[PDB]
Amino acid sequence: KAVCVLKGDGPVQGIINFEQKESNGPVKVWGSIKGLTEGLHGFHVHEFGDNTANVTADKDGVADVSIEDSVISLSGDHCIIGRTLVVHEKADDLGKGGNEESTKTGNAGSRLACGVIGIAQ
Amino acid sequence: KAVCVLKGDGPVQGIINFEQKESNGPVKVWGSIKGLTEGLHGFHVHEFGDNTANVTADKDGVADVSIEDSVISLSGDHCIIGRTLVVHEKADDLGKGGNEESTKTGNAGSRLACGVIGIAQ
Amino acid sequence: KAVCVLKGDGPVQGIINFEQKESNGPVKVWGSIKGLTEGLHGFHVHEFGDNTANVTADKDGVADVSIEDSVISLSGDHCIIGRTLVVHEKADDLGKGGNEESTKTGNAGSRLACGVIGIAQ
């Protein structure tokens, strides 16, 4: 009743067991459910090390970030996602005037979104 | 009744067990549920080390950040996500005037969003 | 009852077992469910190391980022995703005026989206 048994010589390292025992039941909801994810797979082991017996992002770029265990819920309803502007104009001159309109805004720059966001703008 | 048994020689390291015992039942809600996530997978072991017997983000960039165990809920309803402006103009001169309009705003820059956000703007 | 048994010589390294025991039941919902994912596969082992017995993204580019264990739900309904602008104009001069209209906005640049986002704009 174990994961490893050791008789010979040598010191030891990562040996794991892990359980995650999950039992649903009956639910019985009347209507609708939306936004429902069901996933079961986790095993990522980039490098084991070893037994004995130059990274550069130049413009705007990121380096060495790693996120886990993060949930973002913003489902909502009847939503507008994006850029919007509702400038409203008319000219209608009468006399010795001269009607011109430009309604400039102004430049922007130097933003970046890294990681786990949702809406990034 | 164990995870490892050790008889030979050597000192030991990470050996783990972990349980996460979860039992639902009956729920019986009438209506709707939205924004519902169901995931069960965790195992990430970047590097084990070893047994014995130059990172640079230049412009705007980030370095060495790692987040876990974080939840953000802002679902809401009837929402507008994005940039908005409602300048409103008209010209209608009569005489010896001259009607011009520009309504500039002003530049912006030097913002960045890193990690786990939701709405980043 | 184990994963490895060791009698000869040598120190040890990663040996794992992991469980993920999941039991559904009856659900019985009346209506609709949308956005439903069911996946079960996890095993990624980039490099084991070894037993003994120059990366550059130049323009706008990223470097060495890795995300896991992240869920984003923003399903919603009746939504507009993209750029929008509702400038509204008319000219109708009468006299000695002269009706011109330009409604410029302003340039933008230097944004980038990296990782796991959802809506990136």
Numbering used by the authors:
A (entry chain B), B (entry chain A), C (entry chain C): 3 to 55, 86 to 153
Give the exact sentences the study uses for this entry:
The functional human SOD1 is a 32-kDa homo-dimeric metalloenzyme; each subunit consists of 153 amino acids and contains one copper ion and one zinc ion. The misfolding of human Cu, Zn-superoxide dismutase (SOD1) in motor neuron cells plays a crucial role in the etiology of the disease. Instead, it has been proposed that immature forms of SOD1, which lack copper and zinc ions and the disulfide bond in the structure, are the origin for cytotoxic misfolded conformations. Substantial experiments have demonstrated that the full-length apo SOD1 can convert into amyloid fibrils by incubation with reducing agents in vitro.
We produced amyloid fibrils from recombinant, full-length apo human SOD1 (residues 1 to 153) overexpressed in Escherichia coli, by incubating the purified apoprotein in 20 mM tris-HCl buffer (pH 7.4) containing 5 mM TCEP and shaking at 37 °C for 40–48 h. The cryo-EM micrographs, two-dimensional (2D) class average images, and atomic force microscopy (AFM) images show that the SOD1 fibril is composed of a single protofilament with a left-handed helical twist. The SOD1 subunit within the protofilament stacks along the fibril axis with a helical rise of 4.82 Å and a twist of −1.187°. We unambiguously built a structure model of SOD1 fibril comprising the N-terminal segment (residues 3 to 55) and the C-terminal segment (residues 86 to 153) at 2.95 Å. The density of an intrinsic disordered segment comprising residues 56 to 85 is invisible due to high flexibility, which is reminiscent of the internal disordered segments observed in the structures of patient-derived amyloid fibrils from systemic AL amyloidosis. The SOD1 fibril core features a very compact fold containing thirteen β-strands (β1 to β13) and an in-register intramolecular β-strand architecture. Three pairs of intramolecular salt bridges formed by Lys36 and Asp109, His43 and Asp101, and His46 and Glu100 (with distances <4 Å) are identified to stabilize the intramolecular L-shaped interface between the N- and C-terminal parts of SOD1 fibril. Two pairs of amino acids (Val14 and Asn53; and Gln15 and Phe50) from the N-terminal segment and two pairs of amino acids (Gly130 and Asp125; and Arg143 and Gln153) from the C-terminal segment form four hydrogen bonds to stabilize the fibril core. In our SOD1 fibril model, Cys57, Cys111, and Cys146 are all in disulfide-reduced conformations with free thiol groups, and misfolded and aggregated SOD1 evolves from a pool of immature SOD1. Once apo SOD1 dimer converts into its fibrillar form, the SOD1 molecule undergoes a completely conformational rearrangement, with the antiparallel β-barrel of apo SOD1 converted to β1–β5, β7, β8, β11, and β13, the loop between β4’ and α1 converted to β6, α1 and the loop between α1 and β5’ converted to the internal disordered segment, the loop between β6’ and β7’ converted to β9 and β10, and α2 of apo SOD1 converted to β12 in the SOD1 fibril.
